[PDB]
Amino acid sequence: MELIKGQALFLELDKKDFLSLKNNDKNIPTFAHPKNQEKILAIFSLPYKNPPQNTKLIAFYKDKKEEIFIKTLEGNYKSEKLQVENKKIFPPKTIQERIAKELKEANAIYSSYTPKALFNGAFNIPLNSFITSDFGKARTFNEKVASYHSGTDFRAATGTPIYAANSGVVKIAKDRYFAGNSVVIDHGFGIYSQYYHLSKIDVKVGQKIKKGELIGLSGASGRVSGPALHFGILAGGKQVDPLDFVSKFNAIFQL
Numbered sequence: 001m002e003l004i005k006g007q008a009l010f011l012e013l014d015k016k017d018f019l020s021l022k023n024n025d026k027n028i029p030t031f032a033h034p035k036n037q038e039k040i041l042a043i044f045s046l047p048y049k050n051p052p053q054n055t056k057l058i059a060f061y062k063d064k065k066e067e068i069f070i071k072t073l074e075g076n077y078k079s080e081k082l083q084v085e086n087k088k089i090f091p092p093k094t095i096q097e098r099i100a101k102e103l104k105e106a107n108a109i110y111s112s113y114t115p116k117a118l119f120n121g122a123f124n125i126p127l128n129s130f131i132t133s134d135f136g137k138a139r140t141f142n143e144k145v146a147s148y149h150s151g152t153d154f155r156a157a158t159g160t161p162i163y164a165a166n167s168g169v170v171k172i173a174k175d176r177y178f179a180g181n182s183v184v185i186d187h188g189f190g191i192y193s194q195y196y197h198l199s200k201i202d203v204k205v206g207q208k209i210k211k212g213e214l215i216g217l218s219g220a221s222g223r224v225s226g227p228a229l230h231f232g233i234l235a236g237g238k239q240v241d242p243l244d245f246v247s248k249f250n251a252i253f254q255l
């Protein structure tokens with residue numbers, strides 16, 4: 001199979017006599033195919049930075065093993081040539097500490113797998129705006145990816161209402177260093193949506209939020225480049241193309 005880096009892939013497998021799905025010694029969870037009852041699904045993601053050239057998954061069954069080969073593609077992302085090497089930047093220890101703390105808080109949340117659907121049908125757009133900055137915009141130094149845009153940015157003046165893209169449980173609802181005022185929703189199955197640089201947060205941690213329900217007002221908090229909404233999707237343990245994902249997810253979980 002073929003998958004562009006920084007993208008998610010819903011794998012289809014026979015339900016019957018299935019024991020596990022592995023990638024070397026790291027197990028991948030599975031969930032029901034909502035229409036076809038003889039199948040199950042698994043989300044596989046390739047990171048934008050340093051993906052392997054290829055991947056070999058193994059679906060182990062009671063009576064056999066079933067290999068999946070996935071070729072990694074570069075795709076067609078925008079990329080600007082960097083001039084100054086991404087040298088180890090030297091922040092004040094107060095900022096270093098906050099980033100480290102927030103990294104630890106985030107990793108714990110993003111590997112807190114919930115084995116049921118908290119969502120309700122398809123994802124919707126968190127607002128009815130347009131993309132000002134695509135996902136996957138890379139900054140490159142001697143053909144190596146130094147950094148990239150982990151989500152997609154919508155046009156939003158400060159104070160534009162933002163709504164949850166799907167139903168779920170709120171896991172983060174606060175100001176963070178890089179993200180600014182952040183909302184992060186667990187939709188189940190390792191699927192998390194992200195809403196950053198808000199001017200106002202209208203939800204609490206642990207709160208059940210419905211799709212289409214208001215989560216906050218867009219802002220510019222922690223955003224150097226002016227007011228806008230940053231929308232991100234983490235799934236299969238990786239930041240992925242949010243619109244590519246929504247499209248793939250929605251084709252399965254429509255109604």
Ligand SMILES: NS(=O)(=O)c1ccc(-c2ccc(CC(=O)NO)cc2)cc1
Nearest residue numbers: 106149150151153178179194223225230
């Ligand atoms: N879920 S997480 O691990 O806490 C997390 C992931 C990504 C970012 C992030 C930081 C800076 C920018 C720059 C930008 O131009 N935004 O508009 C974009 C995204 C922040 C937090």
Ligand SMILES: [Zn+2]
Nearest residue numbers: 151152153230
């Ligand atoms: Zn952004």
